[PDB]
Symmetry: C7
Subunit: 233 residues, 7 copies
C-alpha cells in the first residue's frame, strides 16, 4: 500500500500500480482440492495478465486509426502503422509483466498449483514413509490451507510452505532478470524516420482539434449574441 | 482503501471509485435462512447496479435536453440525440459493471446465494452420507455464517467456503474478459459527423452562458454605481 | 473514513460527507429496555435528519432576503421567491436523505427499534416455545446488547441479528431506489425565466459588493495618505 | 480524527476542529468517588467552554480598539462598537457550543456526574433490593470505572451505562436543536449601516498599513543605496 | 498525532506543535523509587520548558543585533531594544506553556512525583490501616508502575491513579485559565511609536539585503561574460 | 513506510526509495534447509542489486547514443563518452548499495546464510555439548524459522538470533562507512571540459526537439485550416 | 512517524528528520553477552553520528572548491575558506547531535551498554545478596533481553530497566541543555566581510552557470535550425 502510493508519487506507465494494488487487494483462495489446485493456480497466473493486455490495448486512444488503416486496401503510412502498433504493444506489456512478477515473488499461486504433484519426501514423517501416492495427493493438496490441513502427524506444513515459496521466489527473480536483459538489448538496438512521421501526425491531430474547437467557439458566439438580445428584453 | 485513493490520484470516470468504496464500506450480512439466502444474494448482486445505472443517468447535466427533444413532435438533430444518448448510456454503464466485478471477485454474494442448493457431497462427512436433503438445506444454509454454523461433525465449513469462492472468482474473471472483449470490439468499430455537431452545440452552450453572465455583470454595474452614490453620502 | 475522504476529493453538496462522518463517529447505544427501545430507535432515525434540514436552511446566506420579501406587503419577484426558496429546499434535503440511507444500510436503529415487538418464533428454542409474550418482551429487548443478552439457552442472538439487519438493508435499498426515481423524474420535468432572473440578481449582488469595497478602498486611501504625513514626521 | 481532517479540508470557523480534536485527545478520567464525581463531571462540562470563550476573545486582533473606545469619554462610532463587539462575541461562541455538543453526545461527563445520585432500581439485583442508599452511593459511584467496579452480583454495569448514555445523547440532541433554532431566528431577524461603516474602517486600516509599509520601503531604499556604495568599495 | 497535523494545517507559532509532538513521542518512565520519584517528576515538568525557552531564544534571527546594542556604550533605539526584546520573549514563551499544559492534562508527571508523599488513607485496605509510613513510602512509590506494583492486597492502584490524575487535570485547567486571563489583560493594555520604528528598521534590512544581492548579481555578470568568451573558444 | 514517504518528500536519486520499499514489501522466507540456506541468503544478497544495476542502466534515456558511438569506427567526443558513461554508471550504483545496506542492517539474509555453518558453542546446552556436527547442521539450520525450531532443550533460538543479527549490523555499518569514505574521496578528487561539452550537447538535443515540435505544429496548422473549411460546410 | 512528517511540513536542515526516522526504523538488538554488550552499546552511540558527519560533508556541493584551494600554494580568499569551511561544518553537525539526543532519550543503548557493570544491589533479591560478581555479570547481561532473562527469582528486570532508562533520559536532557547553551553563545558572539565576499562568489557562480546554459542554448539553436531543413525535406 504505502509502496504503491510512493511509486505513484514518483511517477507524478500508470497501470503498473493498478495491477500491483489489485493483486494486493485480491482474496486469493486456493480451493485445496486435488482436481482443481493446478487449474486455479495456473489460472490466477495466466488469465489476469491476458486481461491486462487487452485492457492496455483498448484504453489506448489510437486503436481506432489502426483498425481504419488495417481495413482499407491502401490508406491515406506504408510502415508507421507497424511502428505505432509496436509502440502501443510495448506500452501494453508492462502490466502483465508486473502482475506475473508480483504473483511469483509472493509464492501463493505456485504453492497452490504445484502442491499436490511435487515430491516432498524429506518433509513427510518417517512413519508414513510408505503409502500410496494417491493418498498423499489428497493430503498435500491441503497444504496451502492453514485451517484445513489436519495431518501434522504426517507432514510439516510450514517447512514445505517455505520450500515451495523459495522456489517461487527464485523463479520470479530469474524472470525479472530475463525481462531486464531483453529490455536492455531492445533499447540498445532500436527505425528512425517513422518516429518523426508519427510526431508529425500527432501534432497534426492536436492542431486540428484546437482549430476546430476555436472555430466552433467563434461561430457559436454570433448566434449567442444574436439570441441574447431578447434575453435582455 | 489505499487502492481506491491511488486510483483517484491516477484519475486526477469517477463513480467507479465511489462504487468500489461503497462496496468495501458495506456490512454484508447473509441472513443464513433457507427461504431467503437466494433472495438476499441475488438482490445484493442485481439491485445496486440498477440503482447505480439510474444515478449515472440523473447526474448527467444534459438529460433535460434529451427529454425536451423526445417530447416535441419535431425539435429545433435528427440523429445526434441518438449519439448523445448513447454516449451518456455508455458513461453510465461503468459503475454497475465495476460493482458486479467487485462483488464477484469477493465471493460473498455467490456464497450466500448458492449455498443451500448446491451439491457438496465430497465435503459432507461420510457418517451422514445418507439423510434427507431437506435437512441438508437448513444445514448448508448456515455455511456463510461463521458464528452460527454448529455442525463441524457433518460438513467442513472452510472447504466448502473456499470451493464456492473459487467458483465465484472464476465467474468474475470470465465476466471481466467478456466485457473487455466487447469494449475492444466497440472501440474497433465505432458515426462521425454527429460527434462534430455535438461539439458545436456544446461550444454554443458554453459561449451562450459566458456571454449571458458577462452581460448580466455589465448591466448590473450601472445600477450598482447609481445606488452606491448615496452609499458614500 | 477512507471513503468519506475519497468522496471529498471527488467533490474538490458538502454536508453529505459531514452527515456520513458524524454517523460513523457516533456512539450508538441501544438502551435495551422494553419501554424505550422503540423510542430510541425511531429517535435516532427521525431527529438527526430534522436537525440537518434546519442546519441546511440556516447555513444558506440568502434566507434573509426570503424573509424580507415574505414580510413586506409587496416587495421590490412575484414568483422567483418560489424558485429560489425551492432551490434552497432541494439543496437542503440532501443531508437528511444521506443520514437515513446510511442508518438504514447499517441495521442498528432498525434492530434497536423492532427487536421487542417483532415475532421471532423460528429462532426461539423449542423448549420455551410456550411462554407469556411479556417475558419474551424483556428477553428480546436485550438482543442488540451483546454484553447483556444472557439467554443463549432460549434465543440465538446472532441469527435474529442477521435477520433484522437484512430486513433493514432491504428497506434501505428500496428507499434509495425510490429517491433515485423521484430525482430522475424531477430532473426530467423541471420554470425557465425565473432562473435567468435569479442569475441577474446574483450578478447584481456581486457587482454591488465589489463596487462598494472598491469605493471604500479608494475613499479611505485619501485619509490614510493625509494622516501618514505626520507618521513620517 | 479522519472526520476532523475532512472538516478542515471542507473549511479550506477554525477553532471548532481545535475543540473537537482536543476533546478526542483528552484523557477523561472519572475519579469514581462519591464526594467528587459530580464536581469532576460538571467541571469537564463547564470549565473548558469558558476557557474557549476567553481564548476566542483574545485571539481576535481588534479587541484592542474595543478597549480603547470603551476607555475614552467620547472617542473618535456611537454604535458600531456594539456591532463589532457583538460580531466578535458571536464568532467566539462557536467553540464552547461545539465542546458541549461533543461532550454530551459521548455520555462520559454525564455518566461520571449523575452516577451516584440517580435512581437505578430496575438494574440493582433483587437480592439487595433493600439496603441503605449510602452504600449504594459508594457502589454506583464506581460505575463509570470498569477496572474498579467489583459488584457484578449487585448491579449490571453495562445496562446502567447504556441507560445514562442514552439520556446524555438525548440531552445533546435537544441542545443541538435549540441552538439551531436560535441561529435560524437570529439570521432571519438581523442594523444595516453599521456593517458598511465597519467595512469602511476595515478598508481604512488595510490601506493605512499598506501605505505605511510601502513608504518605509521607499524611504529605507535611499539609506540602503547610500551605504551600499562603500559595500562595493 | 492526527490533532497535531490538523493544527499544523490550520497554521498553514510553530514550535507549539513541535513541543506537543515531542511530548507524545517521549518514553515517560517513572523510576518508581522513593528517593527519585519526586526528582524525576519535577524534572520532566521543569527542565524541558527551560530548554524550549532557550531554543526559542536562539532560533530568532535578530538576537545578534540585540547583543550588539547591549554591548556598545551608546549604539546607533533608546528603547525599541526593549520592545523587540520583549516581543521576542513573548514569542518564546509559547512552547514552555504548551509543554506544561500538555504534561499536566495527562497526569503522568504529577502521578510520578506526588505518589510517595501524598496521603491515600481511603484507598489503603483496612487490614493494613496501621503500619509505619516508611513502608507505605516504598509501597506507594510503585503505584505509577503497572508491571511492578504487587500489593493489590493493600492498595487499589487504579483508584489512586484516577484520583491523582484528576488532581493533575484540575491543576492544568486552572493553569490554562490563568494564562488566558493574563494574555487577555496584556492584549487589552499594551508603546506605539516603537512598533513603527521597528517596522522601519525591518524594511531597511530587507531592502539592504535585496539591493546587495542584486548588485552582486550585476557586478558578477560582467566577469561571467568576460570569462565565457574563452568558454566558447 | 512513513520513512520512505518522508524521504520522497525531501527529494521533492529516486530509485533509492523504490529499492527500500521493495525490500520492506518482500516476503523474506528462509528455506531452513542445510543444503539451501547459504544459497538463499547469498542470493537475496547478490541478485537483487545486480538486477537493480541493470534496471538503472536501461531506464537512462541516453544509453542508445552510447551504443551508437561504441558501434561506429569513428563517430561524429573522443572522450566525453567515457564521461557520460561513467556518470550514468555512478547514477546507477545507488540502488544496489541501498539494497545491500538495508538488507544488512536487518540481519535476515545473514542469519539465513551463516546459521548452519557458524559455531555456536556457548549457546548449545551443556547436555548436548558432544554430538556430531552433522546433526547440529540440521538443528541450527532451523534457527531462523520460528515455527519450525523445536529444540529449545538444545539451543536458545533467541540468543543466537541476536548474536548473528548484531554481527550483520556491524558489517552493515562498516560497509556504510567504507562507501561514504570512497564517495568523499571521489568528490574530493574529480576532467573539466568534458562536462561543458556534454552540457552543450544536452542543450543541443533540447533545442532540436523543441524546434522540431514547433515546426511540426506550424506546418500541420496549414493542413488543418485547409481541411476545416469543409468542416464548417 | 507522525512527528517526523510534521517536522518536515514545518520545514517546508533536512538531514535531521532523516536521522530521526532512520533511528525509529532501526532494529536495535542488544547481543546480551557480557563480552560484547558494552561494545554494541557504545558502537550504536558513536559510529552512526560519525557516518552522519561524513555524509553531511560529502553531500555539500562546494567541498570540491575547498579541496582545490587547500591544494594550491596560493589560490585565486586568504580567509573566506575558513568561513565557508566552518559554515559547512556547522551545517554538518546537526544530524549527529540529533542522533545522539534521540538515542539517549530512548534509553536503549545506555541500557545495553551499562547493564553488566553497573551496581544494582537494591534490585537483586535478598536471598542471592551474596554471590560472585562474575555470575551477576552473566545474569545482568541478559537484562535488556526480555525473551532471554529467566531469573525473575533474582532480579526484577522491569525495575532495573526503568532505573537505567531514567539515567539515560537525564543524561540526554543535560546534553540537550549544554548544546543549546553553546549554540546561544555562538550566535551571540559571531567575521563580517567574509560573509559578503562569499555572497559575491555565490552570485558569481550562479550568473556564470546561467550565462553558460543560455549561450549553449543560443549557439545550438543555429545548428538545430540548419539540420532541421532536411528534416522537413
Ligand atoms: C511421526 O509419527 C509418529 C507416530 O506415527 C509420531 O510419534 C512422531 O512424532 C512423528 N514425527 C514427525 C516428525 O512428524
Ligand atoms: C464423521 O462423523 C464421526 C462421528 O459421526 C466423527 O467421529 C468423524 O470425526 C467425522 N469425520 C469428519 C471428517 O467430519
Ligand atoms: C433448548 O433448551 C434445551 C434445554 O432447555 C437445551 O438442552 C438445548 O440445547 C436448547 N436448544 C437450543 C437450540 O437453544
Ligand atoms: C442476585 O444475587 C444472587 C445472590 O445474592 C445471585 O445468585 C443472582 O445471580 C443475582 N442476580 C443478578 C441479576 O445479579
Ligand atoms: C484487605 O485484606 C484482607 C486480608 O488481609 C483481604 O481478604 C481483603 O480482600 C482486603 N481488602 C481490600 C479491599 O483490599
Ligand atoms: C539442558 O538439558 C537438560 C536435559 O537434557 C535440561 O534439563 C536443561 O534445562 C537444559 N538447559 C538448557 C540451558 O537448555
Ligand atoms: C527471593 O528468593 C526467594 C527464594 O530464593 C523467593 O521465595 C522470593 O520470592 C524472592 N524475592 C524476590 C523479591 O525476588
Amino acid at each position: 500500500m504505502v509502496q504503491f502510493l510512493q511509486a505513484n508519487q514518483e511517477s507524478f506507465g500508470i497501470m503498473a500500480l493498478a495491477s500491483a494494488q489489485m493483486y494486493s487487494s485480491f482474496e486469493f483462495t486456493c480451493p485445496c482440492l486435488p482436481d482443481y489446485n493446478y487449474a486455479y493456480g495456473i489460472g490466477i497466473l495466466i488469465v489476469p495478465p491476458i486481461w491486462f493486455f487487452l485492457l492496455g490495448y483498448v484504453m489506448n486512444n489510437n486503436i481506432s486509426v489502426l483498425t481504419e488503416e488495417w481495413k482499407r486496401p491502401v490508406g491515406k503510412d506504408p510502415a508507421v502503422l507497424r511502428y505505432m502498433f509496436s509502440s502501443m504493444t510495448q506500452r501494453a506489456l508492462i502490466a502483465p509483466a508486473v502482475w506475473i512478477a508480483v504473483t511469483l515473488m509472493d509464492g501463493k499461486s505456485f504453492l497452490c498449483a504445484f502442491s499436490p504433484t511435487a515430491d516432498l519426501s524429506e518433509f513427510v514423517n518417517e512413519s508414513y514413509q510408505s503409502l500410496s501416492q494417491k493418498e498423499l495427493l489428497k493430503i498435500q493438496a491441503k497444504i496451502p490451507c492453514k485451517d484445513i490441513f489436519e495431518e501434522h502427524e504426517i507432514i510439516s506444513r510450514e517447512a514445505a510452505t517455505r520450500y515451495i515459496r523459495c522456489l517461487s521466489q527464485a523463479c520470479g527473480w530469474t524472470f525479472l532478470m530475463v525481462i531486464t536483459l531483453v529490455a536492455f538489448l531492445v533499447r540498445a538496438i532500436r527505425t528512425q524516420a517513422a518516429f518523426l512521421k508519427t510526431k508529425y501526425w500527432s501534432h497534426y491531430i492536436d492542431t486540428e482539434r484546437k482549430l476546430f474547437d476555436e472555430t466552433c467557439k467563434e461561430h457559436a458566439k454570433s448566434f449567442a449574441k444574436v439570441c441574447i438580445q431578447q434575453y435582455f428584453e
